[PDB]
Amino acid sequence: STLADQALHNNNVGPIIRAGDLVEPVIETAEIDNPGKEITVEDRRAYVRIAAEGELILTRKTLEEQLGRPFNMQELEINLASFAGQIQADEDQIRFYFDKTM
Amino acid sequence: STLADQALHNNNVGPIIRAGDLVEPVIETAEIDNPGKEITVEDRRAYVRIAAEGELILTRKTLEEQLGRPFNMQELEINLASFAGQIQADEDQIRFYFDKTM
Amino acid sequence: SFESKKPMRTWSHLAEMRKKPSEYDIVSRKLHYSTNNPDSPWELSPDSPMNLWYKQYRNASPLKHDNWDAFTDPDQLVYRTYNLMQDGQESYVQSLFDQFNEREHDQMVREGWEHTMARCYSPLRYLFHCLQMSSAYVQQMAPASTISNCCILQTADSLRWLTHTAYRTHELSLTYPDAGLGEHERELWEKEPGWQGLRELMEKQLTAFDWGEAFVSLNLVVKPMIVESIFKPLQQQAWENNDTLLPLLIDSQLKDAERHSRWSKALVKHALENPDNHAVIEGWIEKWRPLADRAAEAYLSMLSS
Amino acid sequence: SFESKKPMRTWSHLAEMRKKPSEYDIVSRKLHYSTNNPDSPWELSPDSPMNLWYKQYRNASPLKHDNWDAFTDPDQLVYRTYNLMQDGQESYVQSLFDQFNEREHDQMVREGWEHTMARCYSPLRYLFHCLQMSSAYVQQMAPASTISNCCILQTADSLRWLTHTAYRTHELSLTYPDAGLGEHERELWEKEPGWQGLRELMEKQLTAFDWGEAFVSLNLVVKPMIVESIFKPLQQQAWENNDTLLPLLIDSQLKDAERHSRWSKALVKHALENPDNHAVIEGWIEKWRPLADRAAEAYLSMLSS
Amino acid sequence: SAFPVHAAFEKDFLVQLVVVDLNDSMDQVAEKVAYHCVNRRVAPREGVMRVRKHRSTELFPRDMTIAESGLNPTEVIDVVFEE
Amino acid sequence: SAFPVHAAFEKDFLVQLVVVDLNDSMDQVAEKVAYHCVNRRVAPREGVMRVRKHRSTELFPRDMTIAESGLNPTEVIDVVFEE
Amino acid sequence: AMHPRKDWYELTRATNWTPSYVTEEQLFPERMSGHMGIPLEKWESYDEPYKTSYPEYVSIQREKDAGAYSVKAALERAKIYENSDPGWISTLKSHYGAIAVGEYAAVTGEGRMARFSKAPGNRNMATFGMMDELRHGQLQLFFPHEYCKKDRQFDWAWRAYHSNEWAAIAAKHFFDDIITGRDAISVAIMLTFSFETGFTNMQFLGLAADAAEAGDYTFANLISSIQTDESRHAQQGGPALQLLIENGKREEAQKKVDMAIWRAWRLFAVLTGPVMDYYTPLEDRSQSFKEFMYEWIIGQFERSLIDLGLDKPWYWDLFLKDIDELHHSYHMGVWYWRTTAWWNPAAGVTPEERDWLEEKYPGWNKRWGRCWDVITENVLNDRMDLVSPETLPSVCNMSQIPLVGVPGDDWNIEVFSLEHNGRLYHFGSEVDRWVFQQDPVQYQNHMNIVDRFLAGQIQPMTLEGALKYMGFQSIEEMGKDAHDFAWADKC
Amino acid sequence: AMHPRKDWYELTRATNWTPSYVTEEQLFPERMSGHMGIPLEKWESYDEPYKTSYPEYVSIQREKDAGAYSVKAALERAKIYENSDPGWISTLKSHYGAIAVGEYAAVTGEGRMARFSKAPGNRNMATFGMMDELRHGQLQLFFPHEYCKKDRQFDWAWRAYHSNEWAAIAAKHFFDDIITGRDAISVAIMLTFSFETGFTNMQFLGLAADAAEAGDYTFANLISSIQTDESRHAQQGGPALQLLIENGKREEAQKKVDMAIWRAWRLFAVLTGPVMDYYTPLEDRSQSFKEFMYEWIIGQFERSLIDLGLDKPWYWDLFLKDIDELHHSYHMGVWYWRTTAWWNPAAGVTPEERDWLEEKYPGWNKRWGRCWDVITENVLNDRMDLVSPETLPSVCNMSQIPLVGVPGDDWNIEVFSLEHNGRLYHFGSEVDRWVFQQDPVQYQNHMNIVDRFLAGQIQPMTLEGALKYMGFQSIEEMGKDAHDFAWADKC
């Protein structure tokens, strides 16, 4: 359970984006909108797991800039295949976050 | 020019359908809507060349039946990548045809 | 031994069709495996609570047919084509909202119309949610997937209407902030006499648990009443009060309402293949019509005040 | 020798941008290679007929800027997003047509309104086609692809308006078959005094071959006149005659018209970076305004009759 | 008389249904189980096959019959080798 | 003095630009053309390389210079082998 | 202008009222609602974290489908069926069969909430949930349908839930327990939280990674799009759980989570486990089954469960041991009894594969490898009768899956039995027995396939009789080794 | 209710009127309109056979793009770039470079008709035509754009038409002649009829077949969707031709067709020919270049031309001989001078390939095979200096492509020259010279790349000077053998 305990005791939050046109823009957005957070990316080809410690924000304005075309926040659902963290979403941004620190 | 003359002297008319969901339904439609015409099909993977001698009709009603979902004749343009023959199109059918016999 | 067989062009259950199976046939037909075993609808203890529920409220319904699965949505709607159609209608309605708001439509309604809307329109969100809940119940209890599918789409349409009402209640409140718009609807639903017939009707309808009775009461009695006694009179009142948006909105909602009636009538026709069912359906209609009539009378009296 | 270089994240011409290039930047910018060689726009004999045409009507325009390519459509529309937007607006308009026809809107217009439409509305198809032709000319002559793209979409919008007019002319004729609807429009365009100012304006405008003058006359003079002197008065008249469809239709067309004005004004702002251009633009405006004013006066006199 | 049991054979991966006879000796039951295990998923080996109630510490006598054992139908047994 | 011609070499696939000298003999011109052809796209062979105006029937004398030939700049020539 | 959703959203879920013409309990019966006595007023604090509204839903969902169908259309000629490793084709067959009609059953779980939940936001999100599962069922019938003409096993995309085939019974026993067989709050907790935030990611995204490696983009694109809906409607569970805890029902909530997660685990161990570690070609295994479990269940789901204020399940350590062990045996069982499956299991034990297994599961070769050694030897000596069963496996009275353990050098196997109401039941784990004991009325008179065989319900009592009972309609539909034993050519 | 298009369509094209404030000739100048003196009234009988209307257009075109982009998105990770044969990647590079900005130029040809054609139906169909070509230019910039970050040669999708690279000049000389450089009626005949019903099918559908065999569905799906637009707007030409013939302009119409078809042929012989018979991997050659020509140009296009009442071109027999011969030499030229291309040509002469070529073109090995024999020998003996040029090829004053013939055993090569206005021009065929003579003012002062080199416009006068002149900005952008000569390992 050493391996298991260590897997459980993480504070990684953030989107899992399915393969498509949102992968690179979401990665770039995570980096830009969370300065002073390290962004981790695990590439599984069909999807990419993107994470930061404790909290990761994606703003509509930044995502639109990185994607390069008009974008409404609700459209992210087309490519948001899963996520780590609790979610708080509105017209301006999505926030992935934890209440506890493990 | 034997080979060339023989290639030129054909009366083949009909649609070239690009790879997708219209290929099989158009083939079936050509067979059904032109009884007593032999329908030829050449499969080039990216497209299929479907032909009859002199005239080949595709009706909206039959195409809709073979495709299995509501269908307007104008939608065929989504998958009609080329055609042999002159074309006469309306809301009810498309007709591919020649004026001359070679 | 077994026989050796070749591939079939479609599902084994459709393979005997004359016609080439449609998208609708392929994805809609004969999906309730819960009707296969009369003693045990669900793969559990035969007397588990939900198995007992289904044996009583579905299997034992006096509304009987040997092949409910053969029912066909006359519109043959599937999820994909429903969304195409409703994105069309809903885009259109949202475009109306945008354009009428740009033209400041609400400011030009007849004196006092905001109060009529607050009392007679905004609390519709309760009525429409009841239709939503009730539609979902017919969905989960109906004995064929083709029937349930019509109910799923109808549940969604009910939420569409609720949402229209919520949006316009809020929007109207922007021009008329002192009419209780978005504030007093629960009180009206609970206490206003004009709403009490409707509320009594729906609370009782939501407790008719037999699938057949649920369907008849909802789709043949309640919903047609709403069309003739709520939707259309509201259109007439709006016309008399220079509200030109409401009639257009309601016309879009009526398109949904006529679709619900179309599939309902098609189910009735299917059911009537069994002559016994005429007395059953007519009995349930006669049972609920008094409640529905009183609901409409009370609502109309309120609307006319 | 050459230098060894690594891959660029975008086109070489965009590589110095601070920002990540957008869809618009990638597919719209610096595509007219015909501006590269001043002596030979096109890859032919330097004095071929079309090379002579472009050297005179584009390159030699008094409207001058050292970097027309830097122009940006403020809406940053591309083919893909134009179709999304216009499918939205057009679906909406077609839905209005369907719904108003269902409600028999045309039968309830004020007595005689069909004759006003026959005379003042249906011949708009000629005016709108002239705008279509003229827009296509600015497209083919403009010295930057970003400018031409705005013109392509505007050419399409002009055909959209023409098509609206054609459809409604025919539809109106179904209720009013004895008003010359769909029969007498060419005669009116050619002979009716109220149309002659407009016709004279457009025939002359279509023969202003300098790209700069074509643009100013079309987009800064003619098109704004149409908005204020044709589109809006028609809305007022329709209101006075219980035509409730026409104002909604025109509002959708006005959305296109305001978009054309937006990009036009943005081009002007870009041009005005060169101070010499103010006198040039103002000169062309002063030149054409008299014609445009007479066109509007004549049309309004006819509309008011 | 037919007598169903569920039997786990030593070194196999599962428990299987094996129908034995009311009058079978443990030696015979052990044989009927082995049939469905040895040379299928379990290597043959030297030694005496023994029967015990599942997870039990006590082995049944080799000559004892299932009747004499007191086992009930559909109860679980292990077949193992003497150590 | 530099003198551009366009030369087709026997058995090659194209015509190429070869700049010769106003005072070159046909033997030398034939050499300058061969340079860009033989051992590149044409197999070397025994025999005397000759020059003729394109598609002409007459061969130029081997000792004749391009000056003496009357050829104009950028005219086309063939380089072929005696038969 | 248009007004932003935040300004009018509350009115869309302002739908609770105080019943007057019937009682609150009549309108929301406990057996269908599961409100645990919590009054209506308390449920109004329910706040769905992943919201949508009707206009956005139809527009967005239209776009999702247009992409799914367009990709399928453009790839029809990619020769996936003809050119894919047969282990991958079998993966498709078992997915569509085990999933498609279950997705449609999930419409009923959502419907149960849309009618019977006391929380207004839950009733609305459940309405979109009904629509989502309708989409999923229709997509996953439509996609495999084109393959009917190639292979009768694809008929099972539709037929499976209509059959008594053993795996279909295992699927139905599970889904009827967590989806269609309980009250609305139980659905919220067991289905939307436990199953839909917890396990489905393994089959719809873990598998999608393998599908992309295998070059099957039609399928990977399909299931990943499906999971975008799951991600939204699954978020109905958390707010229900938080509300139960706030209202003094933590123990009851925890028990339902613990139960649903174990039940889901046993099913995925037999469906997804063999797919990931055996059927999927070695070159296409993005990660091992255990690796994906540690990513999706431990690293993601369990951490989220803790964040919400729940505890690790009591059976945690058993669960971890099981991840190392169970699917290797479930795979062995499915393969040995392959003839009762509607897909063709790949053995997955070429020397190259066994090296990978040993690396991913140290000790594998001295355990399961011992059985595969015997099997392989028989195959190389053409003793094929020894690679087909002549009896039934013993089956769990909860999971409906054979009773297994660890074979080979350190053999260990345990069955957990229970006498109850004059009947003897057998379970494949401590937890499965515990699940039964949590709610005996749900299970006590259910008979598993072996119970039925012994009761005389399967006639004749032979392999053929059983295969017929399970719904097989021809020789071709019954499972065979995926490569027709060509893998022995590598041994 | 809605009224059917047939009931209102005539009003959409009832737009001709009799000018009063300017003259008909002022409004429709011959140099821009090309009406050949035919009065307005005669043009009203123009009847476009492939109609559409604004509402249908935006709706349909929205659907076409959604599929094109969705497929691209779903396949981004299919490793096409990394895993494809480099001959296929070069095929993509030469396509996007030669086509993308030319598509955008075609907007101007359509625009010329939309303003200047006297036929009302032509002006409307040309409006949709402008929109179609805008789509095509934007798609074919957008798609290759993602590859910029991998390979500077992809920059040429945008840069090519901005360069003086020899193939870009050949492309521009052609498109500026048939698309942007002539009157509206000439555009209708040369572009929409000749080029767009005649030749584009080779590059957008013939190539799509090869792309599908190569497993590049993003590209095959893209170009086949593009060609669905072509099929509609190309149908503006036929009704123009029929009208000209009815109005006594058959000879003038025939000459324009004859000219445009030959010009198009020479370009496709250098672009599409090498792609189909050499760059595309042997296993992916659906048919040979000649086979595709016989399907698309002879069997389909030429038969359609006859049906409309036109005659086979005077140069028919020369054309047929050319199909057997020209591209084999154009390929050899592009490859030997590969360093001046923006793509990496594949030699395509492994023994297996040469057997295929011999089968598809009996006698190939005793012709082009003779040159490839010398080249191959040099490569095997590492005499690499002999596989790179030290001079310019002679270039056609019409096509802008090197002057070639048949090499080897039955060597034959012919240049067709012309003195005109004190200048000496050289043409690669009888027809190319004839084209020049049909309209000398169009061409007479044009200078091809070799004319410019000789005139002193290219400095310095060396390979490096020329490469710089052509716009190459780094070593990496210049063409090399596609497999870096790895193909010799098979010889």
Ligand SMILES: O=[N+]([O-])c1ccc(O)cc1
């Ligand atoms: O039954 N099933 O297989 C399901 C049910 C629901 C769901 O979201 C996914 C799969």
Ligand SMILES: O=[N+]([O-])c1ccc(O)cc1
């Ligand atoms: O694997 N199983 O669970 C099975 C296999 C075969 C059988 O007859 C019954 C159940």
Ligand SMILES: O=[N+]([O-])c1ccc(O)cc1
């Ligand atoms: O393997 N099986 O599933 C079996 C084997 C034998 C039998 O009598 C019944 C079922």
Ligand SMILES: O=[N+]([O-])c1ccc(O)cc1
């Ligand atoms: O210039 N081009 O390459 C083109 C132009 C037009 C067209 O339809 C296709 C290709």
Ligand SMILES: O=[N+]([O-])c1ccc(O)cc1
């Ligand atoms: O192939 N060509 O046409 C060329 C090649 C090289 C060159 O410098 C000029 C033209």
Ligand SMILES: O=[N+]([O-])c1ccc(O)cc1
């Ligand atoms: O091969 N080439 O294109 C060349 C070779 C030599 C030279 O001086 C100029 C161009």
Ligand SMILES: [Fe+3]
């Ligand atoms: Fe689902």
Ligand SMILES: [Fe+3]
């Ligand atoms: Fe789900």
Ligand SMILES: [Fe+3]
């Ligand atoms: Fe094009």
Ligand SMILES: [Fe+3]
């Ligand atoms: Fe085109």
